[PDB]
């Protein structure tokens with residue numbers, strides 16, 4: 001029993017984190033095979049960052065301007081290039097700790113584990129969800145740039161996020177490992193802000209199923225609804241629209257608990273319109289939306305890596 | 306900025322989990338140097354659940370009754386002994402991935418990371434705290450016994466918990482790595498119940514200081530309180546008593562934010578009185594008590 005915000009075991013990714021220094025800036029890199037990946041803004045001064053021309057800034061740098069340390073060993077940079085907003089540093093040694101991996105781009109509402117690092121040294125791991133506004137509510141301080149987000153499917157690490165910047169509201173923005181930003185953001189010092197966020201409806205429903213599995217049932221009711229009728233309610237309370245694919249994905253949980261998705265949607269309807277009346281669900285007085293249906297199934301089944 | 310329930314990176318512990326089989330029972334073990342640590346109830350049968358005599362059960366076992374799988378490799382058990390409620394299996398290979406480590410017994414209110422494991426392979430990592438009633442609110446399925454809790458100070462792994470059983474209320478009980486249970490519990494299937502749980506007051510205060518550090522001040526007030534008046538109010542909400550030790554420990558956070566500890570105690574009194582009135586603190590509509598003062602300083606500033 002029990003339900004916790006749970007991250008993937010981070011060992012496979014810890015073995016890939018290195019320190020990257022360019023000039024006075026030091027941050028984190030991801031060392032896979034013979035390439036270290038890191039944010040391209042590591043090459044900017046404070047003045048450069050107001051209006052950077054990254055190709056121009058890069059052509060002035062030589063390989064020996066990129067100090068890379070793996071633990072206590074220095075890595076020899078033999079090449080450097082750009083892909084979108086990530087810098088790729090070819091090094092002279094393949095990482096002997098390279099796991100089986102893929103670069104994947106995730107969708108809003110999907111979750112991943114974040115390995116927070118500083119000076120190439122992992123300091124903490126936590127679970128994140130890509131918000132519908134393409135930010136993440138992470139916990140980062142100065143020097144965290146280059147920390148990566150990931151999932152593990154079987155033995156393969158799926159790298160999906162690299163941290164670049166913090167937004168004025170305290171939320172965070174980054175790219176996939178091919179340098180493409182999540183959301184309408186750019187790597188430079190300019191006026192930027194997160195859009196208005198919404199709640200991930202399929203994730204809340206998954207979390208209500210997790211609550212039922214764990215004995216928390218006070219919110220169940222006799223009623224059911226229709227997708228059309230629930231999505232009017234969802235729109236009204238700033239919830240993402242629930243599609244038919246979401247209902248299909250919740251299929252397993254619906255059969256395992258005997259509570260149909262539209263049956264649960266009536267529970268969520270009533271919760272949105274009336275609140276929780278002084279009660280809690282899985283120890284929370286808020287509706288938690290950072291557990292995917294896959295997260296709930298995996299934690300309530302014991303899948304390992 | 307931001308504040309998250311944050312676990313330690315689990316890699317150093319991942320390299321120590323193995324599978325321990327005895328009879329038909331399989332659980333997890335902790336492989337450090339040439340010793341594998343695991344719950345001693347791995348040797349119980351279905352008959353030995355209520356009143357096992359562990360000394361009698363163990364004296365009947367030889368080394369080759371214990372199957373220890375590290376990844377795909379069978380380790381050879383060359384010795385076995387019992388220390389309180391943990392079995393210590395001597396193996397013929399020292400773990401090459403053994404980190405800097407030590408065993409520490411923690412006090413209620415302390416936090417640690419849990420590496421949940423099944424069949425010697427890690428499933429996930431999450432943050433826990435020793436409740437005042439000496440249980441932990443974990444996420445554990447059948448086969449998770451032997452999963453360990455830990456902190457990582459610098460590069461030294463402080464092993465502080467090993468999982469043994471789940472109580473009828475869905476909470477979990479275990480031992481330190483010397484086999485001594487936390488709380489009044491025993492490794493028997495006899496009726497056991499956790500005491501009434503209370504809120505870890507010093508941790509809530511630290512978490513409110515964390516909220517101020519990240520720029521939130523709406524819950525403060527112009528009042529203060531004596532330590533005794535605060536405790537008289539707080540235990541009416543099932544909060545742990547706040548000691549002078551707790552007030553001293555909150556000293557650095559009080560200095561960093563400029564809010565005296567007893568001024569933060571007056572704010573907490575008012576929160577208990579008023580609720581949140583629709584607002585949140587660091588993303589929660591509840592007062593969070595599983596961040597210690599040490600945790601806040603490690604994550605904030």
Ligand SMILES: Nc1cncc(Br)c1
Nearest residue numbers: 140141142165166306
């Ligand atoms: N560089 C940086 C990234 N994320 C958060 C902060 Br605060 C700083």
Ligand SMILES: Nc1cncc(Br)c1
Nearest residue numbers: 001445446447448471
């Ligand atoms: N053996 C066991 C341990 N923890 C939780 C459960 Br449910 C079972």
Ligand SMILES: [Cl-]
Nearest residue numbers: 410411412415
């Ligand atoms: Cl302690």
Ligand code: NA
Nearest residue numbers: 221223263266
């Ligand atoms: Na219903």
